[PDB]
């Protein structure tokens, strides 16, 4: 029934430098014989992934409804994988979840906050979320767009899993201070938890 494993998200603007350091975060488990398991959201594991990449490339014309539940979709197809990595004590890494599909909806498309959050409600909630904190300044790649989003991104920045890192440092210290949180997640099994708990 327990959790073994440890799930991380990474979070935070398209700049931000999420893959940078989710990956230097694998590779130092990995060097330490921990098991684990580097996924991203949105991918194109199926078709689903497929249309959100026609989405983000501008080349069909989707509704904002729409392709928010396509976002959540890929994610809940990933969750008989994830519980079982985790349960077998294997970790998952992962670039972007539900506060992505959020954060963009609410603030990029205006879509109403409780809406966005309501299908991701019951997705496995991670020990920890990393967010990569770059402020915007001078598709969605305007500027304006980006601050809309880095707004709604606030919308977690109180709650205890959400560990707010500085990426405007040097690239080797946001590591370190990473794997500085990382040594502080309980060592332990736990229950299973889900959003938005
Ligand atoms: C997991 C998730 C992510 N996002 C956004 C949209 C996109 O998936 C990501 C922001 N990064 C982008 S738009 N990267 C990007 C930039 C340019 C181009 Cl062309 C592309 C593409 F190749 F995928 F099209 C991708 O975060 C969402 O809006 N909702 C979600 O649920």
């Known amino acids: 029934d327990k959790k073994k494993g440890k799930f991380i998200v990474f979070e935070g603007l398209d700049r931000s430098g999420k ?15 921990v098991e684990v398991k580097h996924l991203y959201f ?15 490339k501008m080349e ?24 079982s990595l ?6 998952v890494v992962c670039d972007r979840y539900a506060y992505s599909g959020v954060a963009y909806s609410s603030g990029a498309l205006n879509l109403n906050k409780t809406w966005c959050m309501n299908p991701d409600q019951g997705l496995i ?6 967010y990569l904190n770059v402020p915007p300044n001078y598709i969605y790649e305007k500027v304006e767009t980006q601050k809309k989003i880095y707004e709604t991104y606030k919308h977690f920045a109180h709650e205890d899993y959400w560990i707010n890192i500085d990426a405007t440092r040097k690239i080797e210290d946001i590591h370190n201070d990473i794997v500085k949180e990382v040594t502080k997640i309980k060592v332990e099994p736990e229950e299973f938890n889900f959003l938005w708990s």
């Open 86 to 91: 985790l349960l077998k004590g294997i970790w």
């Open 60 to 83: 069909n014309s989707m509704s904002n409804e729409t392709i928010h539940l396509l976002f959540s979709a890929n994610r809940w197809e990933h969750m008989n994988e994830i519980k």
């Open 19 to 33: 893959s940078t350091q989710s990956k230097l975060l694998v590779e130092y488990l990995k060097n330490n014989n």
């Open 125 to 130: 909630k991670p020990d920890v979320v990393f």
């Open 42 to 56: 949105p991918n194109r594991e199926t078709g689903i992934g497929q249309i959100i990449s026609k989405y983000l």
